[PDB]
């Protein structure tokens, strides 16, 4: 619930659950616990709910590569504790 769960020695949690965190330019970070086929959009919308952001205003990158809402933990090959980076993005309309 509001507690932190142990995970030492556990690769994957029951039916392919793994955790990722998303960190902004400003050093603000939220983590999420997500399943392997589930799109990155789910954590992104959750980020907006928790940490007070608008979804079209934020876009995610992995090491200088754009990652898109249709992309995934399977597709980007995310870990049990992944780290994903945010840029605040001008969308032109």
């Amino acid at each position: 619930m509001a507690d932190e769960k142990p995970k030492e020695g556990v690769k994957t949690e029951n039916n392919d659950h793994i955790n990722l965190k998303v960190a902004g330019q400003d050093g603000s970070v939220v983590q999420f616990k997500i399943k392997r086929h589930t799109p990155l959009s789910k954590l992104m919308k959750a980020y907006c709910e928790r940490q007070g952001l608008s979804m079209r205003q934020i876009r995610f990158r992995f090491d200088g590569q754009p990652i898109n809402e249709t992309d995934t933990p399977a597709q980007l090959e995310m870990e049990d504790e992944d780290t994903i980076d945010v840029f605040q993005q001008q969308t032109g309309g």
């Binding site: 029951n14 039916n15 997500i34 589930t38 789910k42 959750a46």
Partner: peptide
Amino acid sequence: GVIDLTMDDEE
């Protein structure tokens, strides 16, 4: 421990 998400059923 922040976000446990779902759009798939939980398990």
